[model samples]
Target: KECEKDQFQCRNERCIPSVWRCDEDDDCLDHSDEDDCPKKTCADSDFTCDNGHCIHERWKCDGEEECPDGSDESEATCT
Candidate 1:
């Protein structure tokens, strides 16, 4: 099978949509998708979590808390 253009390869050799990386969901069975995320400044379209990881802006206010620091669902941030 082929991964889509916007897909990412997991350490376990699994293919997952890039959007799932750092979105707070463990799309990769090994949880590698959410590991080693970019800690540097994120793109304008990205969101920086309190834990120093970067996630998509769309993940903010999407309901499920994605950040390990829980900042994504914080009343001051999300609501």
Candidate 2:
């Protein structure tokens, strides 16, 4: 398979989306998509979840679950 420069070639010779890397989803069957992937840090004005996902800082303790894992409304964040 001929992968374009914008694609990510997996170890098994699979051509996947370049955006798939560091997305926290294992796109490569050989688990190479996340190897050495750096965790994302959010903007200072944003709230960062334990899973490395980001959300608006003011959303924290808003009595709403803005984070997929509910970290936005968790006790740790509310405090």
Candidate 3:
């Protein structure tokens, strides 16, 4: 079925309810629904993603993509 305007399309070709977008959970197996979400402010010790997502600075260089955009694990920030 075609996803309606009020629905969100998962990058992996799945259709989900638009309201599930950015709900802070990986409803979409591809995790696309939560991608590109907006954040308000980061804490003093937060490691803000290049996309403006807030995370702990400690999470950076943790060898994992904590931030949706993988900014936390950027090569330049690691070595």
Candidate 4:
């Protein structure tokens, strides 16, 4: 789902698309916003894909860690 610009949850820092999060850092302003977020699973393209829902793994990797496991781009490697 596309988050509305004015939505309360969207107002959170991490709620924005492409935003990064750290292990001890709370990206979301309320923190509860990421409670049900899914883990960013790596796809065949070596890029992480979330279920299009607001999950922990929804954020895309820009050379940063957003999820606890850092698996957003886990499958990415140089062959």
Sliding window of 10 residues with minimal summed lDDT for model 4: 48-57
Model 2 accuracy (lDDT, Cα):
0.83
Q: How would you order the candidates by lDDT, starting with the best?
A: 3, 2, 1, 4
- TM for candidate 2 is 0.50
**Between candidates 3 and 4, which one is better according to TM-score?**
3
Best by the lDDT measure: 3
Over the full model, what C-alpha lDDT does candidate 1 score relative to the true structure? 0.81
Best by TM-score: 2
The global C-alpha lDDT for each of the candidates, from Candidate 1 onward, is 0.81, 0.83, 0.86, 0.44
Candidate 1 C-alpha RMSD relative to the actual structure: 11.3
lDDT of 4 by residue, 40-73 (tens): 5444444433332222433545566554565454
TM-score of each: 0.45, 0.50, 0.47, 0.23
lDDT of 1 by residue, 11-57 (tens): 88789889888877788989899898775477777788887677888
Candidate 3, poorest ten consecutive residues by summed lDDT: 38-47
- lDDT per residue as tens, model 2, 7-79: 8888888988989977778888888877887746688788988777899888888888888899888888776
Which regions of candidate 2 are displaced past 4 Å?
A: 1-40
What residue pairs clash in candidate 3, if any at all? none
Residue 28 alpha-carbon offset, candidate 2, angstroms:
24
Clashing pairs in 1: none
- What is residue 34's positional error in candidate 2, in angstroms? 19
lDDT of 1 at 71: 82
